[PDB]
Amino acid sequence: SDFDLIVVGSGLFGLTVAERAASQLGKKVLIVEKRSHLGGNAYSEAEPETGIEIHKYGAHLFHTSNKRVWDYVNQFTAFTGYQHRVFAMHNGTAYQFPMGLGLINQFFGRYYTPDEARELIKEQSAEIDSKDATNLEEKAISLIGRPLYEAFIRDYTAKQWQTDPKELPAGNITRLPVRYNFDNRYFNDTYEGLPVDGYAQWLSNMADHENIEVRLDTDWFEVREDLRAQNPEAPVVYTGPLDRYFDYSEGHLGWRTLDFETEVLNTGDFQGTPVMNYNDAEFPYTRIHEFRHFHPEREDRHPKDKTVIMKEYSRFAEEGDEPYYPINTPSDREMLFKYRELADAETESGKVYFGGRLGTYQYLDMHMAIASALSMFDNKLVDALK
Amino acid sequence: SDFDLIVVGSGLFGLTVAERAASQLGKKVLIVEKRSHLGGNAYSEAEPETGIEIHKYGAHLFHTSNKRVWDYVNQFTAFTGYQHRVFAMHNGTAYQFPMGLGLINQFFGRYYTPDEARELIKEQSAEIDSKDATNLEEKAISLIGRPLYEAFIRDYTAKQWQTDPKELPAGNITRLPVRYNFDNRYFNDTYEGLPVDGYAQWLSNMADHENIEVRLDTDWFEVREDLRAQNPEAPVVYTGPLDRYFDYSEGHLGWRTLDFETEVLNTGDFQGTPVMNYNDAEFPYTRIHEFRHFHPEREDRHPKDKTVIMKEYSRFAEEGDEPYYPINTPSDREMLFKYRELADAETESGKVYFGGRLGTYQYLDMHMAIASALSMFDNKLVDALK
Ligand SMILES: Cc1cc2c(cc1C)N(C[C@H](O)[C@H](O)[C@H](O)COP(=O)(O)OP(=O)(O)OC[C@H]1O[C@@H](n3cnc4c(N)ncnc43)[C@H](O)[C@@H]1O)c1[nH]c(=O)[nH]c(=O)c1N2
Ligand SMILES: Cc1cc2c(cc1C)N(C[C@H](O)[C@H](O)[C@H](O)COP(=O)(O)OP(=O)(O)OC[C@H]1O[C@@H](n3cnc4c(N)ncnc43)[C@H](O)[C@@H]1O)c1[nH]c(=O)[nH]c(=O)c1N2
Ligand SMILES: O=c1ccn([C@@H]2O[C@H](COP(=O)(O)OP(=O)(O)O[C@H]3O[C@H](CO)[C@H](O)[C@H](O)[C@H]3O)[C@@H](O)[C@H]2O)c(=O)[nH]1
Ligand SMILES: O=c1ccn([C@@H]2O[C@H](COP(=O)(O)OP(=O)(O)O[C@H]3O[C@H](CO)[C@H](O)[C@H](O)[C@H]3O)[C@@H](O)[C@H]2O)c(=O)[nH]1
Ligand code: NA
Numbered sequence: 001s002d003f004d005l006i007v008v009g010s011g012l013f014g015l016t017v018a019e020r021a022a023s024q025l026g027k028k029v030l031i032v033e034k035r036s037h038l039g040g041n042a043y044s045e046a047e048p049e050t051g052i053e054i055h056k057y058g059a060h061l062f063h064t065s066n067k068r069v070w071d072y073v074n075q076f077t078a079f080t081g082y083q084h085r086v087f088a089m090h091n092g093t094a095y096q097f098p099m100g101l102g103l104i105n106q107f108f109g110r111y112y113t114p115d116e117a118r119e120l121i122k123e124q125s126a127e128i129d130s131k132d133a134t135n136l137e138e139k140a141i142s143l144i145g146r147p148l149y150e151a152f153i154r155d156y157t158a159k160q161w162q163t164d165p166k167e168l169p170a171g172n173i174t175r176l177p178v179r180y181n182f183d184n185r186y187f188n189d190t191y192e193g194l195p196v197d198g199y200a201q202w203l204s205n206m207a208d209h210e211n212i213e214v215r216l217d218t219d220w221f222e223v224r225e226d227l228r229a230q231n232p233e234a235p236v237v238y239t240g241p242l243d244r245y246f247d248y249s250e251g252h253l254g255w256r257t258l259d260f261e262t263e264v265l266n267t268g269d270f271q272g273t274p275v276m277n278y279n280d281a282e283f284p285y286t287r288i289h290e291f292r293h294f295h296p297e298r299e300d301r302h303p304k305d306k307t308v309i310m311k312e313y314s315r316f317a318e319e320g321d322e323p324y325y326p327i328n329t330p331s332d333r334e335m336l337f338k339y340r341e342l343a344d345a346e347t348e349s350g351k352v353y354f355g356g357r358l359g360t361y362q363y364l365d366m367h368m369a370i371a372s373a374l375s376m377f378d379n380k381l382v383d384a385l386k
Numbered sequence: 387s388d389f390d391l392i393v394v395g396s397g398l399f400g401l402t403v404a405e406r407a408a409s410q411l412g413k414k415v416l417i418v419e420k421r422s423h424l425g426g427n428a429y430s431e432a433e434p435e436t437g438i439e440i441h442k443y444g445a446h447l448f449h450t451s452n453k454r455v456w457d458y459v460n461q462f463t464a465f466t467g468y469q470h471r472v473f474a475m476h477n478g479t480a481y482q483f484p485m486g487l488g489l490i491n492q493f494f495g496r497y498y499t500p501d502e503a504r505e506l507i508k509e510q511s512a513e514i515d516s517k518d519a520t521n522l523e524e525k526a527i528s529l530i531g532r533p534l535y536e537a538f539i540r541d542y543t544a545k546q547w548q549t550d551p552k553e554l555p556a557g558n559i560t561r562l563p564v565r566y567n568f569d570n571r572y573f574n575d576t577y578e579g580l581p582v583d584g585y586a587q588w589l590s591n592m593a594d595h596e597n598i599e600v601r602l603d604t605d606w607f608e609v610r611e612d613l614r615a616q617n618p619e620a621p622v623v624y625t626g627p628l629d630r631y632f633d634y635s636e637g638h639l640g641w642r643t644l645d646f647e648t649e650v651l652n653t654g655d656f657q658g659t660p661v662m663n664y665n666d667a668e669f670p671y672t673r674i675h676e677f678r679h680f681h682p683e684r685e686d687r688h689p690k691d692k693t694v695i696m697k698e699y700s701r702f703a704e705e706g707d708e709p710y711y712p713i714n715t716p717s718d719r720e721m722l723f724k725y726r727e728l729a730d731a732e733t734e735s736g737k738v739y740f741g742g743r744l745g746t747y748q749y750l751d752m753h754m755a756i757a758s759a760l761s762m763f764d765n766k767l768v769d770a771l772k
């Protein structure tokens with residue numbers, strides 16, 4: 001046949017399943033992608049005026065402690081030694097971030113030793129006991145005290161969720177957000193970096209195999225009857241939206257979306273750092289990304305007098321809006337397992353597998369998407385293709 | 387013969403020359419070392435109570451942009467991904483360091499953009515023009531202004547040199563010590579790390595060759611007549627003190643020394659960071675090192691309740707004191723080139739080469755010592771050994 005496997009969607013999940021089938025099972029894989037480009041939401045492209053690489057669907061920072069995933073992705077791209085660090089803008093001051101000795105010194109006015117800082121946080125947070133916290137506000141205060149909560153958590157959280165924190169579940173904080181040293185590495189994982197030649201080159205290399213065919217600007221639901229007729233035996237891995245597959249027969253799953261406002265400025269350096277969080281309510285956006293600083297190794301290929309920045313705004317997703325984060329209201333949860341059983345019937349009846357961020361109504365870091373694909377490959381698709 | 391080459395001193399210079407002769411020319415090398423251990427001033431050892439690795443002759447942070455040196459040293463040890471960062475203690479506050487947007491925000495009270503910070507520094511430093519500066523104090527003020535100079539430079543410099551900055555040459559500052567971003571990586575080089583198994587293992591691996599013999603606790607000047615008699619043709623690479631070789635026939639070269647006060651504390655974490663500079667005159671020491679933080683990857687082999695710290699004090703070196711930094715008074719400089727011509731005569735008359743930090747009255751970073759040895763090997767010793 002012209003293909004042994006159809007993959008719907010060319011994001012990291014689809015690309016991983018496709019590449020494994022192609023290179024390990026020697027199968028022909030047809031990938032069907034609705035957008036004009038490969039790579040799903042990890043896709044990046046140059047800004048036309050400056051040439052600076054910008055992430056189209058949000059800043060994407062790669063990090064993992066999963067060695068298998070790390071070894072895998074390094075077949076398709078090399079990574080820079082970039083370490084993500086974040087600063088937090090509060091009342092006209094940039095604070096070291098996340099919360100640790102640096103922030104604590106800046107915000108309480110003098111140096112606290114590790115042991116002194118531990119003691120300080122015990123005092124500040126003594127007010128509410130964690131077991132007795134009823135909502136997000138209280139749970140936070142129970143961990144770090146009112147001053148820290150009100151300066152760095154309250155308004156930021158309110159902006160992201162479009163909701164008063166008093167009206168959010170206590171279960172949404174599970175650990176102490178405070179470091180008792182000066183380590184401001186944003187991520188805790190063994191491996192971290194950015195693709196040396198950008199995300200688009202990386203994702204593209206995954207699809208670059210003699211056994212893989214890619215059809216861009218193609219909606220699965222418009223071509224499916226035709227494609228499966230050509231080889232009825234070929235299984236489908238579907239990574240598009242789960243509810244849309246079943247025609248919203250159980251109603252629409254709820255998502256948060258993001259609006260990005262991208263400006264080219266006539267300065268070489270807007271904030272001297274990749275990501276500045278904006279913690280005060282007076283700013284509509286949650287944070288500003290300055291993309292040249294994601295790739296300092298490319299400095300002499302960047303304009304010296306211009307820079308690209310992007311402000312991020314959070315709101316609930318209406319029809320047509322890009323789906324980014326699942327909301328997971330209890331209504332959403334019940335709607336989900338109704339769809340799960342639809343999906344499982346569809347797999348046994350139609351050899352159609354559901355995966356990925358959209359296919360399973362889930363937030364997945366990139367290494368999680370890849371891990372999950374590697375697993376579906378190993379525990380399902382290997383059998384389904386003999 | 388029992389040896390084809392004698393190397394005096396087992397520091398990085400000597401070890402590099404020895405290893406190259408041994409492995410590249412297949413020569414037998416005898417290394418003569420006065421102390422009880424290998425490795426010279428880069429030597430490190432475990433503290434007996436905690437097991438934590440401590441650098442015996444000062445903190446040693448490896449960094450280079452010389453790829454040849456980097457490739458070379460990676461034959462003998464692997465390096466961690468440690469990146470050195472320093473904090474600066476001033477009036478009870480830990481400042482981000484070196485001077486950059488972080489410090490500037492903390493010290494002037496609010497956030498300055500790159501462009502605003504540039505403007506601020508232009509204003510502050512406008513007082514003295516750099517070309518008109520007569521001493522160290524003025525030259526500094528001409529670059530960064532009086533407030534920054536007085537808080538972070540003046541007393542620190544005074545402690546290190548044991549001298550009022552007004553009484554130091556303007557030539558001792560050559561560039562603007564200010565960063566116009568939030569990057570607080572202490573070093574600017576391509577390659578940086580710490581030896582995974584510590585310095586002692588690394589230096590030891592360099593000497594570990596079938597063609598290399600090492601004699602510890604052996605003073606060159608006590609054994610030389612005997613050793614050269616065994617093979618009069620064998621050249622000597624001498625890395626001991628230059629003036630002591632020629633019996634101080636031109637008087638004693640001047641050095642700064644360092645006193646280290648090393649304490650084991652009954653806490654797991656004294657300052658939450660490897661190096662805290664102490665910028666105020668009220669503290670006798672220039673900085674405190676907390677050595678567990680040089681190797682965070684060894685945390686579950688470190689005591690959880692104990693930690694080793696070391697305070698550093700600077701003063702002029704008296705007889706017997708370890709020589710660390712050359713002083714380079716003009717008296718010292720003239721004394722030096724008198725010795726240089728003694729040395730060159732000694733090479734042509736005695737096949738004795740002078741190299742290394744002591745052999746040439748010089749401060750050398752480790753990658754510079756290695757580079758310099760690689761060069762003496764390539765441009766002198768190859769010929770001198772055929
Ligand atoms: C705002 C934001 C920011 C980040 C991140 C997510 C979000 C929402 N991520 C996570 C990362 O984006 C995620 O891991 C991957 O997008 C998952 O790839 P998927 O294959 O699961 O779906 P993904 O959404 O990427 O791809 C699915 C593809 O299917 C296509 N499609 C849908 N319906 C179709 C149809 N009917 N026919 C054909 N094609 C169809 C879509 O066009 C799309 O290309 C992240 N992770 C991380 O590790 N670090 C980070 O810093 C970030 N940053
Ligand atoms: C306080 C301080 C701190 C640092 C550093 C230096 C100093 C002074 N260094 C620099 C580093 O220490 C330096 O590069 C190496 O010590 C140079 O090695 P040498 O071989 O030149 O001399 P080195 O002094 O190391 O070795 C000479 C050897 O000869 C021996 N010897 C002397 N006379 C003898 C005799 N008569 N007979 C036999 N043996 C004799 C001595 O005992 C010694 O072992 C550093 N660099 C860097 O890159 N990063 C850092 O962070 C630091 N930190
Ligand atoms: O300054 C801050 C930052 C975060 N939060 C709290 O922490 C939650 C999560 O913070 P972020 O979403 O900003 O950060 P995450 O670490 O959870 O995730 C970040 O890293 C991910 C990579 O794994 C993706 O890039 C993602 O979009 C990006 O926000 C917020 O909703 C809020 O409740 C604060 O209160 N203040
Ligand atoms: O807080 C500070 C630090 C430095 N200085 C000025 O800068 C000079 C040099 O500073 P340091 O000696 O502290 O630092 P260096 O970067 O020059 O060298 C450091 O890094 C070297 C590695 O290459 C060695 O480890 C060395 O011992 C260690 O001090 C000082 O004399 C002083 O004039 C200040 O004014 N304030
Ligand atoms: Na509490």
Ligand code: NA
Pocket residue numbers: 511512513514515516527528529
């Ligand atoms: Na000036």
